[PDB]
C-alpha cells in the first residue's frame, strides 16, 4: 500500500543524501594538515585538588569568570568552588540525591541540576536572606535528565532519556519548545557560542543540529557505532566533536555536513565520558573510562599528552572561558585543575 | 666463633624484614578506623625495629660500650614501643568485636575522631606503663670488667625484680591474650548464630574461614610471646646458674619476640582485601 | 522582610551594666557575621565589636577590650552585647550590622534601626574626608573624596573600601562595597572610582533623596575605621 | 599569612561547610540502602503496602535501623545508563510471584512470565556493577500457588521437571532454579523468603538478611573473611 | 494503523527537507578551521604555556 512506497522513498532520499555528501568530499583533513608543525609535548601539572565530595562526581560546569565552579555528586549536594583558593562558597542540599547533570548560569545568578527524578531544579544563588533556595522545579520529562544548559536567566535547554529535548521558560515553568526526532536516550547537549543553535547526542549513535526558536532539525550526523556520551562545539561554532563507547572521538563539520577527523588508538578500548575543546580549538581533551584523560591534536589526530592522576573513571571535563585551566572530575570524589 | 655470628645474623635479618614490611605498609597507607589502627601498629613496629639493632652488638660481643644515655634511650624506645604494639592488637580485637557482634549500637561510636583519641590514649598509656625502665635502667658492671644494658633494680633485695616481672607478665600477656580470645570466641559465636538465623547456605565455608584466621593470629602471638615470659618467670621463681647455652636460648627467644612485630603487619594489613586493592597498583 | 530590631537602651549611671539585644527576623542568622557600630551625638560612626558565623572569631575595638562582651544565640536569632563599667564616652546610638563573607559577597549590607544609651555625667589606619560640607544645587554632579594613610590595594587585586549614606533620621545604608561595585537596591547614578590611597565617589544627576552624610570605611585589617563624614546640604 | 580579613572569613566559612559535609557523611553512611526490582506487577504493590514520576524512595525505621528503598518502576529507559548509580547499595530486593507460571505476558506467546522473571534476574544478578552485592529474593502469592497447583502441573513451565505436583517440592524446584542462575557464587549470597504472610515477618527477614550482609562486609574489611 | 503511516510521512518529510541543504567543499572548511586555529594560537594558554607571573593558579 503506502507503507512500502514511503519506505522506498525514504531509502531513495537517504541514498541521494549519501551521494551528495560523497560528491562534496575532495580532500581529507589529514591531506591539508600534514604540512603544519606538530603540536609537540603537552605536560599539564595538577595545580588544585578540590576535596569534600563523599561519592561519585557526575557533573561539573565552569563559570563565566573562570574562577567559580559547580560540581554535583551522589551525596545529594551541590558545591560551588573558588578554584583560585580551593574555598567552598555554597553547599546546596538536593531533594533527590540521584543527580546526573548541573549547569551554571552565564550571569552567575542561578545553578541548575537534574537526574533520575525527572525534574530540573533551578537554584537562586543571590538571595536577600543569604541562603540558596529552590527557585523553580521544571517537570514534564518522562525520562531521566542527562544534560541542561542555560541560555539566559529565563531560558534553559534540557535533554532527557525519553528521546526528547526541551526549551523551558523559567518564569512560567512551561515547556516552550519540544525537540523530537531521536530514537534513543539523549545523553549530551552543547550550545553554540551565538545562542542560536545547539546539537545533541543520543544512544542511537547519531547527533542532530537544532534551532532554539524554530524547533526543527537541520542536519543529522552519523558514523559512531555506539552510544554518544558527550558533545562539544568548536570555538567558532562551525564544528563539533563527539565521544562514544567505541573508544573513538569524531569531528563533524556543519557547513560540509560530513565527518572530518577520527581520534582513536589501538591501545584504547574504553569508552569516552567527556569531551572539551581548547580556546583556539587546536587541542581536544577527552575523558575516558581507563581513569585518565588524553589530549588530542584536533588537526593532526595525534596524541599530544595524557592527564593521569585519577583513581577511578573520569566523568566530566571543562575548560575555562579564557582557557587558562582544565578541570577534571572523577568517580573517586575529587576535582583537579591542570595547567 | 660461629654462635655469636649466627645469632647476630638472625638479629640483623629479623631487623631487615621488619623494616621492609613496616615501611611498605606505611608507604601504602600514607600520602576509616581500620586504617588508623593499622598505621599506628605500623609506626609502633617500625620504631621497634629501629630500636632492635643496638643489642645485636651485645649478642655479638659481650660488653655494651655504648655508654649510658644510649642504653637508657634504647630501653626507653623498646619498652614503649613493645607495649604500644600489644595494646594496638588488643584495641583492634575490641574494634572487630564491636563491628561484628554489635553492628548497630557500635556504629555510632565508630568514628575517625574516636579512633584518633584511642590511638593517642594508647600511646600515652604505653608511655606511662614503662616508668620503671625509665627510672632504674642503666649498666651492671660485671666482675670481669664488662657491662650489660639491663635494669638496675636498687638494693640487693629481689622483691623489686619479682614484683616487676609479675606486673609486666600480667599486664603484657594475660589481659591482652584473654581479651583477644574472648573477643574472637564471641565473634565466632555471633557469625554462627547469624548464619543459622537467616537460614542461608554456605555456612560451613564462613565458619571454617574465620576459625582459621583467629587460630593463626592467636597461635602466632602465643608462640612468640610465651617463651620469653616463661623463661623470665622460670629464672625468677627458681635459682638457675648462668650457662652459655641458657644465654643462647634467651637471646633466641628475645629475637623471636621482635618476630611478632615483623610478622604481625603481614597478618593485619596484607591478607585484607582492602589493602590488596592499594597494593595491586604498586605490584 | 529583613529586620534587625534593637533593645536595651535608656539612661545609665556611670559604672553600671546594661545588655543590648539585637533581634533578627527574615534571614538566616546563623550564616551571617554580626557587627556592633555606634554613633555619638557628634555625628561620627565608630566600630565596636564583631562576632563571626559559628562564634569562632571575635574582635573588639581598642576602647572596649575588657569591658564589652559580644555573644549570639543562633536558635533564638538574637545578638547580645554585654556592656560593663560604662563611662560617659559610651553615650552613642548602637547599631547592629549584618555581614557575610565569601567570594563576591556584599558585606555590611543591612543595618538595624539602632538603640540609644545615655550615660549621665597607633598602627590603626586613618581615613580622612577633607570636605565636611558641600552645598550644591540638585541635578549636578558631586564628587566626594576620602584618602587613606595606608594603601588598601591588597596583593590579591581587591581594594577594600566601602561607602555609606545616612539620610537624616535614618540608618546608614551601603552604596559601594569594594571601590567599584554598586550595592543592591541603590540607583546606578552612584559611581565609585579610585586607586591606591585616593578614592572618589561621583553622584551624577543628584536628587533630593540623596541628601545626607556620606561615610568611607575600610575592611583591610581590624579594627575597621570610618571617616569624619561629608554632609551634602540644600 | 598573606590573607585579608575577608579572605580569612571566607576560609572559616569554607571550614564550616566542610564540617557540615563531614557530619552528614556519617548519617549517609549509617543508612541501609536497598534497590527494589521486579518484573511487571508481581509483588510491587504488596511490599510497599506492608509499610503501613521517576524514582520512588521509601523511608522507614525498624529496630534502630534506617532503611532506604529505591523503586525503579516507571523508569522506561535504557538500564545500562543509570544502573551504575546503585553500585554501593547494601542489598537488592527481588520480587517474583509464584502464580505466574501458567500465565503469558499477552504480547509474546513464547515468552513465559516466569521465564521473563528469570531472564531479568540473570541480567541483574550477574551485572558487572553488582559482583559483591547480595540479593534478597521474595516469592509472593504462595496461597495462589496452593490453589492453582492442584489443577495445573508445573510441567507447563519446566518440561524437564520430574517431580510430584505438590506445593513443597514445586516451591523447592522454583527456588533452586532461581538460585542456579547465580554464577558469582564465590562472592555473593542469595537469600530466599516466602512472603505470602499477612504477619509482619517480611520486615524481620529483611532485617536479618541485612544484618548478615553487614556482618560479612565488616569481616571482609577486617580480613578475617 | 495510521500511526505507522504518520511516522513514515514525518520521516520522509524530514529527510526531504534535510536533503535540500547547501554544502561547501570539505577542503574549504578544513582550511577555515586551520585558519581559525592559526589566528588564535597565541591566545591559548594550554597550547602555549604562560609565564608563572601571569598564571592565576601559580
Ligand atoms: N624487649 C626485649 C628486650 C628488652 C630489653 C631487655 C632484654 C632482655 N632482658 C629482659 O628481658 C629482662 C626483663 C626485661 C627487661 N626489659 C623488659 C621488658 C619487658 C619485659 C621484661 C623485660 N630480663 C632479663 O634481663 N633476663 C632473663 C634471663 C636471664 C636471667 C637469669 C638468667 C640465668 C641464665 C641465663 C639467662 C638469664 C638474664 C636476663 C629484652
Closest by CA to A197, choosing from A227, A251, A238, A228, is A238
Residues C103 and C7 both lie in one domain? yes
Which strand (E) or helix (H) includes residue C81? strand C78-84
DSSP C30: G
Question: What CATH number should be reported for the domain whose range is A2-338?
Answer: 2.130.10.10
CA distance A224 to A205: 5
Radius of gyration (C-alpha) of chain B in whole angstroms: 21
Determine the Cα–Cα distance for residues C194 and C214; give it in Å rounded to an integer: 16
User: Which atom belonging to ligand 1 lies closest to the Cα atom of B228?
Assistant: 11
Burial code of E31-55, b = ≥16 C-beta within 10 A, e = fewer? ebbbebbeebeeebbbbeeeeeeee
* Antiparallel, parallel or unpaired: β C133-135 and C230-233: parallel
Distance in angstroms (rounded) separating the CA atoms of residues C159 and C169: 31
Maximum Cα–Cα distance across chain C: 50
Query: Among positive and negative, which fits the CA dihedral B266, B268, B269, B272?
Result: positive
Cβ–Cβ < 8 Å for B37, B229: no
Domain count, chain E: 1
DSSP, collapsed to helix, strand or coil, labels residue E14 as helix
* B contact chains, 3+ CB pairs < 8 A: D
Question: Half-sphere exposure (CA, 13 Å, Cβ side) for B23?
Answer: 8
Q: Which of residues 85-144 of D touch A (CB under 8 A)?
A: 85, 88
Distances (CA, A) of A113 to A86, A122, A199, A233, B162: 22, 7, 20, 22, 73
CB D31 within 8 A of CB C123: no
Same domain, C131 and C109: no
Q: How many Cα neighbours within 13 Å face the side chain of D120?
A: 19
* Residue C115 sits in the same domain as residue C153: no
Please, which residues have CB within 8 angstroms of residue C52's CB and are 6 or more apart in sequence? C33, C58, D9, D12
Among all residues of chain A, which has the CA nearest to that of D76?
A: A143
DSSP classification of residue E49: P
**What distance in Å separates the CA atoms of residue A298 and residue A271, rounded to the nearest whole number?**
19
Name residue A202's beta-bridge partners: A186
Q: What letter does residue C76 receive in the DSSP assignment?
A: T
Instruction: Give the nearest partner residue to E26 out of A26, A39, A84, using CB atoms.
Output: A26
Q: Which of D126, D20, D142 is nearest to D83 (CA)?
A: D126
Peptide bond into C223 cis (omega under 30): yes
Domain end point (choices C102, C119, C136)? C119
Residues 6+ apart with CB under 8 A from D143: D196
Residue E37 to residue A220, Cβ atoms within 8 A = no
Surface-to-core class of residue D109, CB atoms within 10 Å of its CB (0-12 exposed, 13-18 middle, 19+ buried): exposed
Contact B51, B81 (CB under 8 A): yes
Report chain C residues whose CB lies below 8 A from the CB of D2: 155
Q: Look up residue C118 and give its three cell numbers.
A: 545615655
Å from CA of B233 to ligand 1 middle: 10
User: Quick one: cell of C228?
Assistant: 569624619
d(CA A61, CA A67): 11
Alpha-carbon distance of A95 to A71, in angstroms, equals 16
D78 close contact with A: CB closer than 8 A: yes
Helix, strand, coil percentages for chain C (3-state, nearest 5): 5, 45, 50
Q: Which of C90, C119, C148 is where one domain is finished?
A: C119
Q: CA-to-CA distance for B263 and B85, rounded, in angstroms?
A: 12
Map chain B to HEC letters: CCHHHHHHHHHHHHHHHHHHHHHHHHHHHCCCHHHHHHHHHHHHHHHHHHHCCHHHHHHHCCCCCCCCHHHHHHHHHHHHHHHHHHHHHHHHHHHHHHHHCCCCHHHHHCCHHHHHHHHHHHHHHHHHHCHHHHHHEEECCCCCCCCCEEECCCCCCCHHHHHHHHHHHHHHHHHHHHHHHHHHHHHHHHHHHHHHHHCCCCHHHHHHHHHHHHHHHHHHHHHHHHHHHHHHHHHHHCCCCCCHHHHHHHHHHHHHHHHHHHHHHHHHHCCCHHHHHHHHHHC
Q: Are residues C26 and C105 in the same domain?
A: yes
Judged by CB atoms closer than 8 Å, whether chains meet at A255 and E47 is answered as: no
Residue to mutate among A280, A283, A328, with most E CBs inside 10 A, is A280
D77 and A CB contact within 8 Å: yes
Q: Residue C103: which of A68, A129, A130 has the nearest Cβ? A: A68
Determine the Cα–Cα distance for residues B220 and B68; give it in Å rounded to an integer: 35
Grid look-up 632504674 returns B136
- The minimal CB distance from B103 to the residues D26, D185, D211 is found for D211
Name the β-bridge partners of A166.
Answer: A158, A178
Based on the fold, state whether residues C79 and C104 are members of the same structural domain.
yes
Find where cell 585543575 sits: A337
Residue from A134, A165, A132 nearest A148 by CA: A165
Determine how β-strand C68-73 pairs with β-strand A293-297.
unpaired
B11 CA distance to ligand 1 middle (Å): 16
Distance separating alpha carbons of residues B173 and A66, to the nearest angstrom: 62
Half-sphere exposure of D108 (CA within 13 A, CB side): 6
Q: Are C52 and C151 contained in the same domain?
A: no
In terms of Cα–Cα distance, which of C108, C125, C106, C122 is closest to C227?
C125
- Cβ-in-10-Å burial (0-12, 13-18, 19+) of B198 comes to buried
Q: Name the domain count of chain C.
A: 2
C-alpha cell at C206: 543628584
| Closest C-alpha among A22, A52, A34 to residue A329 | A52
- List the end-to-end C-alpha distance of chain D, in Å, as a whole number: 50
Instruction: Give the residue from chain B lying closest to D187, CA to CA.
Output: B202
Sign of CA dihedral D162, D167, D168, D171: positive
Q: Are C114 and C171 in contact (CB under 8 A)?
A: yes
Please give, one letter per residue, the 3-state secondary structure of B40-90.
HHHHHHHHHHHHCCHHHHHHHCCCCCCCCHHHHHHHHHHHHHHHHHHHHHH
E44 touches chain A (CB under 8 A): yes
Domain boundary among C119, C147, C181: C119
CA distance from start to end of chain A: 63
- Burial tier of C15 (Cβ tally within 10 Å: 0-12, 13-18, 19+): exposed
Q: Is D137 on the interface with B (CB under 8 A)?
A: no
Cα angle B238, B239, B245; round to 5: 105
| Residue that has been written with the C-alpha cell 557547513 in this structure | A255
Place of cell 555619638: C40
Three-state SS for chain D is CCCCHHHHHHHHHHHHHHHHHHHHHHHHHCCEEEEEEECCCCCHHHHHHCCCCCCEEEEEECCCCEEEEEECCCCCCCHHHCHHHHCCCCEEEEEEECCCCCCECCCCCCCEHHHHHHHHHHHHHCCCCCCCCEEEEEEECHHHHHHHHCCCCHHHCCCCCCCCCCHHHHHHHHHHHHHCCCCCCCCCCEEEEECCCCCCCHHHHHHHHHHHHHHHHHHHHHCCC
Rounded CA-CA distance B20/B24 in Å is 6
Contact (Cβ atoms closer than 8 angstroms) between residue A78 and residue A96: no
Between the alpha carbon of residue C59 and those of residues A48, C33, C49, D2, D154, the distances in Å are 32, 12, 6, 19, 82
Q: Report the DSSP beta bridge partners of residue D112.
A: D104
Whole-angstrom distance, CA of residue B230 vs CA of residue B169: 9
| Domain ranges within chain A, ordered by starting residue | 2-338
Considering the domain architecture, whether residues C113 and C134 belong to the same structural domain is answered as no
Quick one: cell of A211? 534551532
Q: Are strands A335-338 and A326-330 parallel, antiparallel or unpaired?
A: antiparallel
Grid coordinates representing E31 are 582550511
Distance CA(C206)–CA(C140), nearest Å, equals 6
Q: Which of A87, A98, A161 minimises the CB distance to D77?
A: A161
Cα–Cα dist A308/A288, whole Å: 11
Whether the CB-CB separation of B126 and B172 falls below 8 Å is answered with no
A291 conformational bin, left if phi > 0, alpha if psi -120 to 50, beta if neither = left
Q: Quick check: helix, strand or coil at residue E18?
A: helix
Residues with CB under 6 A from ligand 1: B 78-79, 82, 150-151, 168, 231-232, 235, 240, 242, 246-247, 250, 254, 257
The H-or-E segment that residue C116 falls in is strand C115-119
Tell whether C149 and C78 lie within a shared domain. no
Find all residues with CB under 8 Å of D3, minimum gap 6, and list them: D11
Alpha-carbon gap, residue A234 to E34, rounded angstroms: 12
Backbone dihedral region for residue B198 (phi beyond 0: left; psi -120 to 50: alpha; all else: beta): alpha
Q: A337 is written with which cell numbers?
A: 585543575
Short-list D65, D56, D36, D19, CA closest to D140: D36
- CA dist., res. A243 & res. C1, Å (int): 50
Distances (CA, A) of A109 to A68, A192, D6: 12, 21, 21
Q: Of B32, B198, B211, which to mutate for an interface test with D (greatest number of D Cβ within 10 Å)?
A: B198
For ligand 1, what atom is nearest to the CA of residue B235?
Answer: 31
Domain region containing C17: 3-119
Classify the C-alpha dihedral B226-B232-B236-B242 as positive or negative: positive
Around B148, how many Cα atoms within 13 Å sit in the side-chain half-sphere? Answer: 10
Give the method used.
cryo-EM
Q: What are the residue ranges of helices labelled H in chain E? A: 2-19, 26-39
Give CA–CA dist D125/A20, Å, rounded: 49
CB atoms within 10 A of CB C106: 17
Q: Specify the length of chain D in residues.
A: 225
Query: B257 to each of B11, B264, B269, how far by Cα in Å?
Result: 11, 11, 19
Range of the domain at E18: 1-58
> Residue B181: CB partners within 8 Å, gap ≥ 6?
B218
Rounded to whole angstroms, the Cα distance separating A201 from B126 reads 63
Which residues are paired to C83 by β-bridges?
A: C18, C68
Ligand 1 centroid vs B224 CA: distance in angstroms?
15
Judged on CB neighbours under 10 Å (0-12, 13-18, 19+), D140 is: buried
Q: What is the 3-state secondary structure (H, E, C) of chain A?
A: CCHHHHHHHHHHHHHHHHHHHHHHCCCCHHHHHCCCCCCCCCCCCEEEEECCCCCCEEEEEECCCCCEEEEEECCCEEEEEECCCCEEEEEEECCCCCEEEEEECCCCCEEEEEECCCEEEEEECCCCCCCCEEEEEEECCCCCEEEEEECCCCEEEEEECCCEEEEEECCCCEEEEEEECCCCCEEEEEECCCCCEEEEEECCCEEEEEECCCCCEEEEEECCCCCEEEEEECCCCCEEEEEECCCCEEEEECCCCEEEEEECCCCCCCCEEEEEECCCCCEEEEEECCCCEEEEECCCCCEEEEECCCCCCEEECCECCCCCCEEEEECCCCEEEEC
In sequence order, which residues have a C-beta less than 8 Å from that of residue D186 and are 6 or more positions away? none
Mark yes or no for CB contact A52/D21 under 8 Å: yes
CA atoms B94, B99, B102, B106: torsion sign: positive
From D198, D164, D157, select the one nearest D178 (Cα to Cα): D157
| Chain B residues within 8 A of D216 when measuring between CB atoms | 206
Q: Is B104 on the interface with D (CB under 8 A)?
A: yes
How many C-beta neighbours within 10 Å does residue D61 have? 9
Three cell numbers written together for A315: 566523568
Which of B62, B126, B150, B236 most suits a substitution to test ligand 1, by most atoms within 8 Å of the C-beta? B150
CA distances from D215 to B100, C160, D88 (A): 5, 58, 16
Nearest CA to ligand 1 atom 2: B254
| Residues A171 and A196 sit within 8 Å (Cβ to Cβ) | no
Cell of E13: 518529510
The CATH number covering residue C180 comes to: 2.60.40.10
Amino acid at each position: 500500500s503506502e507503507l512500502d512506497q514511503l519506505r522506498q522513498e525514504a531509502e531513495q532520499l537517504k541514498n541521494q543524501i549519501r551521494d551528495a555528501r560523497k560528491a562534496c568530499a575532495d580532500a581529507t583533513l589529514s591531506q591539508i594538515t600534514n604540512n603544519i608543525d606538530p603540536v609537540g609535548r603537552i605536560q599539564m601539572r595538577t595545580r588544585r585538588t578540590l576535596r569534600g565530595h563523599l561519592a561519585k562526581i557526575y557533573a561539573m560546569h565552569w563559570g563565566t569568570d573562570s574562577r567559580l565552579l559547580v560540581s554535583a555528586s551522589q551525596d545529594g549536594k551541590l558545591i560551588i568552588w573558588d578554584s583560585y583558593t580551593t574555598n567552598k562558597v555554597h553547599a546546596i542540599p538536593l531533594r533527590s540525591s540521584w543527580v546526573m547533570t548541573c549547569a551554571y548560569a552565564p550571569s552567575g545568578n542561578y545553578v541548575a541540576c537534574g537526574g533520575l527524578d525527572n525534574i530540573c531544579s533551578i537554584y537562586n544563588l543571590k538571595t536577600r536572606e543569604g541562603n540558596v533556595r529552590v527557585s523553580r522545579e521544571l517537570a514534564g520529562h518522562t525520562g531521566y535528565l542527562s544534560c541542561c544548559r542555560f541560555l539566559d536567566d529565563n531560558q534553559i535547554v534540557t535533554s532527557s532519556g525519553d528521546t526528547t529535548c526541551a526549551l523551558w521558560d523559567i518564569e512560567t515553568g512551561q515547556q516552550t519548545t519540544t525537540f523530537t526526532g531521536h530514537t534513543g536516550d539523549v545523553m549530551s547537549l552543547s550550545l553554540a557560542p551565538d545562542t542560536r543553535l545547539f546539537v545533541s547526542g543520543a544512544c542511537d549513535a547519531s547527533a542532530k543540529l537544532w534551532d532554539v526558536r524554530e524547533g526543527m532539525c537541520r542536519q543529522t550526523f552519523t558514523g559512531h557505532e555506539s552510544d554518544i556520551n558527550a558533545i562539544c562545539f568548536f570555538p567558532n561554532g562551525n564544528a563539533f566533536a563527539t565521544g562514544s563507547d567505541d573508544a573513538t572521538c569524531r569531528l563533524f563539520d556543519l557547513r560540509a555536513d560530513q565527518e572530518l577527523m577520527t581520534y582513536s588508538h589501538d591501545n584504547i578500548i574504553c569508552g569516552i565520558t567527556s569531551v572539551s575543546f581548547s580556546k583556539s580549538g587546536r587541542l581536544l581533551l577527552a575523558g575516558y573510562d581507563d581513569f585518565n584523560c588524553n589530549v588530542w591534536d584536533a588537526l593532526k589526530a595525534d596524541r599530544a599528552g595524557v592527564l593521569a592522576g585519577h583513581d577511578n573513571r573520569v566523568s566530566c571535563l571543562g575548560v575555562t572561558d579564557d582557557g587558562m585551566a582544565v578541570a577534571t572530575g572523577s568517580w573517586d570524589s575529587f576535582l583537579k585543575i591542570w595547567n | 666463633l660461629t654462635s655469636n655470628a649466627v645469632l647476630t645474623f638472625i638479629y640483623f635479618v629479623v631487623c631487615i624484614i621488619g623494616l621492609c614490611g613496616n615501611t611498605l605498609v606505611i608507604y601504602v597507607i600514607l600520602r576509616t578506623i581500620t586504617n588508623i589502627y593499622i598505621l599506628n601498629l605500623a609506626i609502633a613496629d617500625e620504631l621497634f625495629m629501629l630500636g632492635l639493632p643496638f643489642l645485636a652488638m651485645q649478642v655479638a660481643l659481650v660488653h655494651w660500650p655504648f655508654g649510658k644515655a644510649i642504653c637508657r634511650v634504647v630501653m626507653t624506645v623498646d619498652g614503649i614501643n613493645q607495649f604500644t604494639s600489644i595494646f594496638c592488637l588488643t584495641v583492634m580485637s575490641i574494634d572487630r568485636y564491636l563491628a561484628v557482634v554489635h553492628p548497630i549500637k557500635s556504629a555510632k561510636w565508630r568514628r575517625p575522631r574516636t579512633a584518633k583519641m584511642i590511638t593517642m590514649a594508647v600511646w600515652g598509656v604505653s608511655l606511662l606503663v614503662i616508668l620503671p625502665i625509665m627510672i632504674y635502667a642503666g649498666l651492671r658492671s660485671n666482675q670481669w670488667g664488662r657491662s650489660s644494658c639491663t635494669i638496675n633494680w636498687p638494693g640487693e633485695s629481689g622483691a623489686w625484680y619479682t614484683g616487676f616481672i609479675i606486673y609486666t607478665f600480667i599486664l603484657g600477656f594475660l589481659v591482652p591474650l584473654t581479651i583477644i580470645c574472648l573477643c574472637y570466641l564471641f565473634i565466632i559465636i555471633k557469625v554462627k548464630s547469624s548464619g543459622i538465623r537467616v537460614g542461608s547456605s554456605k555456612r560451613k565455608k564462613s565458619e571454617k574461614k574465620v576459625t582459621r584466621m583467629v587460630s593463626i593470629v592467636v597461635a602466632v602471638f602465643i608462640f612468640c610471646w610465651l617463651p620469653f615470659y616463661i623463661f623470665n618467670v622460670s629464672s625468677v621463681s627458681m635459682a638457675i646458674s648462668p650457662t652459655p647455652a641458657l644465654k643462647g636460648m634467651f637471646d633466641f627467644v628475645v629475637v623471636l619476640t621482635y618476630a611478632n612485630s615483623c610478622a604481625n603487619p603481614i597478618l593485619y594489613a596484607f591478607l585484607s582485601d582492602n589493602f590488596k586493592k592499594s597494593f595491586q597498583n604498586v605490584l | 522582610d529583613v529586620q534587625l530590631v534593637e533593645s536595651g537602651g535608656g539612661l545609665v549611671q556611670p559604672g553600671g551594666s546594661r545588655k543590648l539585644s539585637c533581634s533578627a527576623s527574615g534571614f538566616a542568622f546563623s550564616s551571617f557575621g554580626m557587627h556592633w557600630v555606634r554613633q555619638a551625638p557628634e555625628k561620627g560612626l565608630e566600630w565596636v565589636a564583631y562576632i563571626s558565623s559559628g562564634s569562632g572569631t571575635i574582635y573588639y575595638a581598642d576602647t572596649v577590650k575588657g569591658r564589652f562582651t559580644i555573644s549570639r544565640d543562633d536558635p533564638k536569632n538574637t545578638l547580645f552585647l554585654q556592656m560593663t563599667s560604662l563611662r560617659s564616652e559610651d553615650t552613642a546610638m548602637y547599631y547592629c550590622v549584618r555581614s557575610i563573607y565569601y567570594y563576591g559577597s556584599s558585606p555590611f549590607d543591612f543595618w538595624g534601626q539602632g538603640t540609644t544609651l545615655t550615660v549621665s555625667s597607633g598602627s590603626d589606619i586613618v581615613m580622612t574626608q577633607a570636605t565636611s560640607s558641600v552645598p550644591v544645587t540638585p541635578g549636578e554632579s558631586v564628587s566626594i573624596s576620602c584618602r587613606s594613610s595606608k594603601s588598601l590595594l591588597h596583593s590579591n587585586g581587591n581594594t577594600y573600601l566601602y561607602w555609606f549614606l545616612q539620610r537624616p533620621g535614618q540608618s546608614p545604608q551601603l552604596l559601594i562595597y569594594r571601590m567599584s561595585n554598586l550595592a543592591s537596591g541603590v540607583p546606578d547614578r552612584f559611581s565609585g572610582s579610585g586607586s591606591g590611597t585616593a578614592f572618589t565617589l561621583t553622584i551624577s544627576r543628584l536628587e533630593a533623596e540623596d541628601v545626607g552624610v556620606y561615610y568611607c570605611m575600610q575592611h583591610l585589617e581590624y579594627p575597621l575605621t570610618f571617616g569624619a563624614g561629608t554632609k551634602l546640604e540644600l | 599569612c598573606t590573607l585579608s580579613a575577608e579572605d580569612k572569613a571566607a576560609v572559616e566559612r569554607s571550614k564550616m561547610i566542610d564540617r557540615n559535609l563531614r557530619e552528614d557523611g556519617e548519617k549517609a553512611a549509617r543508612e541501609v540502602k536497598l534497590l527494589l526490582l521486579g518484573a511487571g506487577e508481581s509483588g510491587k504493590n504488596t511490599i510497599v503496602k506492608q509499610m503501613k514520576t521517576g524514582i520512588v524512595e521509601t523511608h522507614f525505621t525498624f529496630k534502630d535501623l534506617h532503611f532506604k528503598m529505591f523503586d525503579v518502576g516507571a523508569q522506561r529507559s535504557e538500564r545500562k545508563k543509570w544502573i551504575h548509580c546503585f553500585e554501593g547499595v547494601t542489598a537488592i530486593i527481588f520480587c517474583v510471584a509464584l502464580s505466574d507460571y501458567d500465565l503469558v505476558l499477552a504480547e509474546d506467546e513464547e515468552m513465559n512470565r516466569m521465564h521473563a522473571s528469570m531472564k531479568l534476574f540473570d541480567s541483574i544478578c550477574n551485572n558487572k556493577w553488582f559482583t559483591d552485592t547480595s540479593i534478597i529474593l521474595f516469592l509472593n502469592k504462595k496461597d495462589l500457588f496452593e490453589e492453582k497447583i492442584k489443577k495445573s502441573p508445573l510441567t507447563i513451565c519446566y518440561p524437564e521437571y520430574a517431580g510430584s505436583n505438590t506445593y513443597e517440592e514445586a516451591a523447592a524446584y522454583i527456588q533452586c532454579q532461581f538460585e542456579d542462575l547465580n554464577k558469582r557464587k564465590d562472592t555473593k549470597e542469595i537469600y530466599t523468603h516466602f512472603t505470602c504472610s499477612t504477619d509482619t515477618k517480611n520486615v524481620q527477614f529483611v532485617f536479618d538478611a541485612v544484618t548478615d550482609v553487614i556482618i560479612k562486609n565488616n569481616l571482609k574489611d577486617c580480613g578475617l573473611f | 494503523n495510521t500511526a505507522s503511516i504518520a511516522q513514515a510521512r514525518k520521516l520522509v518529510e524530514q529527510l526531504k527537507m534535510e536533503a535540500n541543504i547547501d554544502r561547501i567543499k570539505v577542503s574549504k572548511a578544513a582550511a577555515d578551521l586551520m585558519a581559525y586555529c592559526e589566528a588564535h594560537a597565541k591566545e591559548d594558554p594550554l597550547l602555549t604555556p604562560v609565564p608563572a607571573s601571569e598564571n592565576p593558579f601559580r
